[PDB]
Amino acid sequence: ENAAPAQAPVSDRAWALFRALDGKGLVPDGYVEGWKKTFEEDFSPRRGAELVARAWTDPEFRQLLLTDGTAAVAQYGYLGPQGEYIVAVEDTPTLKNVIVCSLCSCTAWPILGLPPTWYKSFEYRARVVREPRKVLSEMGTEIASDIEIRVYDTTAETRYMVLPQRPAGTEGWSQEQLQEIVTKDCLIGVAIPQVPT
Amino acid sequence: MDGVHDLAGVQGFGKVPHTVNADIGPTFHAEWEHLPYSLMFAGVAELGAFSVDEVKYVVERMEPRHYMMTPYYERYVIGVATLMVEKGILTQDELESLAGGPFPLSRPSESEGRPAPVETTTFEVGQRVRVRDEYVPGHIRMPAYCRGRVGTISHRTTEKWPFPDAIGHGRNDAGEEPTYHVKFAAEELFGSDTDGGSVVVDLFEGYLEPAA
Ligand SMILES: [Cl-]
Ligand SMILES: [Cl-]
Ligand SMILES: [Cl-]
Ligand SMILES: [Cl-]
Ligand SMILES: [Fe+3]
Ligand SMILES: [Mg+2]
Ligand SMILES: [Mg+2]
């Protein structure tokens, strides 16, 4: 009762699906290898960090990114699959934003990178909508009690990124230096950018 | 579809398996893991055989215990394979033959889907809306926690998309609708049993009605 179905190893299944389609001429030459390189090398949270660092140092860009995120992203050439309609959500001294896809894994791939295992976990999908403060605390991020947490559930085509607050002690840093501290987790909304000493 | 995939709000799960900024390792942790997505794109963009929405639905159609025990990327292997069999492109026999053993698929759909709603309303930013108290056995992009609940519009998209509940079944009658960012108070969705502030759900126009 309630046992798993019998299954061949997953890698055997996955490559069976490839070979079945490839052997019918349905997969162009180099097609899955090309998508693998896109996924690994081009879709990257370095791109969302670049966007946050520009917004932090350019009030006009900041305004653009918060009003028409798609156009802002397009300036950099970072629109792409699962990241065609972009909304950036602004953290403030009383508001902390966090992104999930409760139904599956929906993420702004080109600017955040493909989601991490933990973001697609049942634990995150179930819990962050209902108890985001406790989830973040458990993950290492304490949100002061004076801050509304707002969770965006990525249920349609909008693809989100968080614009975190700029931490004190970064005044006058270059865009390069600022990018370095805007991590994947800061874009998702579960981490606050950290300044070393 | 009120499946086990509609996880938001479910209680009893443990800790998220991460601490912030921990090393998540490479993009793909096994040499096959790029295949589901790549093959979804082949199916959507090169073959024209199905929509992305049909991929989301076929994963929802995994047998529920099968869904709950299956790692993420494997669910998409199963789902894309299932769609290739359902569309007549592949056979389950040849998948099993090449795999060298069992390759169970998602279950058949129990709904033909539904069309884009004929009657809907253009809402504006600041407007109070309720999520229609409807039950859809087929695909729908409405998590049950917001069904029948009331919130306020913070955005109407400037683009329109096919209605999931149609195009997720491959129907010809998905139309196009904008979606709306609907902000609900935490207490509207979970009563006193939440530590949160608000939740914003991106909801198709066809899932909404004016509030009381
Ligand atoms: Cl992870
Ligand atoms: Cl492999
Ligand atoms: Cl209550
Ligand atoms: Cl209506
Ligand atoms: Fe998703
Ligand atoms: Mg400053
Ligand atoms: Mg349910």
Largest alpha-carbon pair distance within chain A?
63
Distance CA A123, CA A91 (A): 24
Q: Give the CA count within 13 Å in the CB-facing half-sphere of A107.
A: 25
Distance CA A41, CA A38 (A): 6
Contacts of B206 (CB under 8 A, 6+ apart): B116, B117, B120, B163, B165, B177
Distance CA A148, CA B194 (A): 13
Do residues A135 and A125 touch, judged by C-beta distance below 8 A? no
Q: Give the CA count within 13 Å in the CB-facing half-sphere of A15.
A: 10
Tokens of B34: 């790029």
Q: What is the Å distance from ligand 1's center to B20 Cα?
A: 10
Residue A31's φ and ψ, nearest 5 degrees, are -60, -55
Taking CA atoms, B98 is separated from A9, A33, A91, in Å, by: 12, 21, 51
| Ligand located closest to B7 CA | 7
Q: What is the Å distance from ligand 1's center to A49 Cα?
A: 19
Do residues B85 and B39 touch, judged by C-beta distance below 8 A? no
Do residues B208 and B131 touch, judged by C-beta distance below 8 A? yes
Distance CA B33, CA A14 (A): 8
- Please choose, from the candidates A155, A18, A40, the residue with its C-alpha nearest in 3D space to the C-alpha of residue B157: A155
User: Using what technique was this structure determined?
Assistant: X-ray
Distance CA A91, CA A192 (A): 10
Let me know if A186 is a catalytic residue. no
Do residues B183 and B200 touch, judged by C-beta distance below 8 A? yes
Residue with the two structure tokens 């397009």: A74
Residue B109's φ and ψ, nearest 5 degrees, are -65, 140
Taking CA atoms, B182 is separated from A10, A97, B6, B78, B179, in Å, by: 39, 15, 18, 33, 9
**For residue A116, how far is the Cα from the chain centroid?**
9
Q: Do B8 and A11 touch (CB under 8 A)?
A: no
Distance CA B10, CA B13 (A): 8
Contacts of A75 (CB under 8 A, 6+ apart): none
Q: For residue B125, give the DSSP letter.
A: T
φ/ψ region of B25 (left if φ > 0, alpha if ψ in -120 to 50, else beta) reads left
Resolution in A: 1.3
φ/ψ region of B69 (left if φ > 0, alpha if ψ in -120 to 50, else beta) reads alpha
**For residue B199, how far is the Cα from the chain centroid?**
18
CATH assignment of A1-197, given 3.90.330.10, 3.30.930.10, 3.40.50.300, 3.30.300.10?
3.90.330.10
Let me know if A174 is a catalytic residue. no
Residue A57's φ and ψ, nearest 5 degrees, are -105, 0
Distance CA A106, CA A53 (A): 24
Residue A82 Cα, gap to closest chain B Cα (Å): 10
Q: Is A46 on the interface with B (CB under 8 A)?
A: no
Largest alpha-carbon pair distance within chain B?
58
Do residues A32 and A40 touch, judged by C-beta distance below 8 A? no
Residue of A33, A91, A127, A135 to mutate for B, most B C-beta atoms under 10 A: A127
Contacts of A194 (CB under 8 A, 6+ apart): A167, A181, B21
Tokens of A173: 């840093």
| Residue B147: other Cβ atoms inside 10 A | 17
Q: For residue A42, give the DSSP letter.
A: I
Do residues A124 and A135 touch, judged by C-beta distance below 8 A? yes
Distance CA B140, CA B160 (A): 16
Q: Do B38 and A36 touch (CB under 8 A)?
A: yes
Q: Catalogue all structural domains in chain B, each as residue range(s) with its CATH number.
A: 1-110 (1.10.472.20), 111-212 (2.30.30.50)
**Helix A59-67, helix A45-57: angle, nearest 10:** 130
Q: Give the CA count within 13 Å in the CB-facing half-sphere of A134.
A: 15
- Please choose, from the candidates B66, B146, B129, B138, the residue with its C-alpha nearest in 3D space to the C-alpha of residue A155: B146
| Ligand located closest to A155 CA | 5
Every domain of chain A and the residues it spans:
1-197
Distance CA B113, CA B58 (A): 13
Let me know if A101 is a catalytic residue. yes
Q: Do B7 and A126 touch (CB under 8 A)?
A: yes
Q: Do B9 and A130 touch (CB under 8 A)?
A: yes
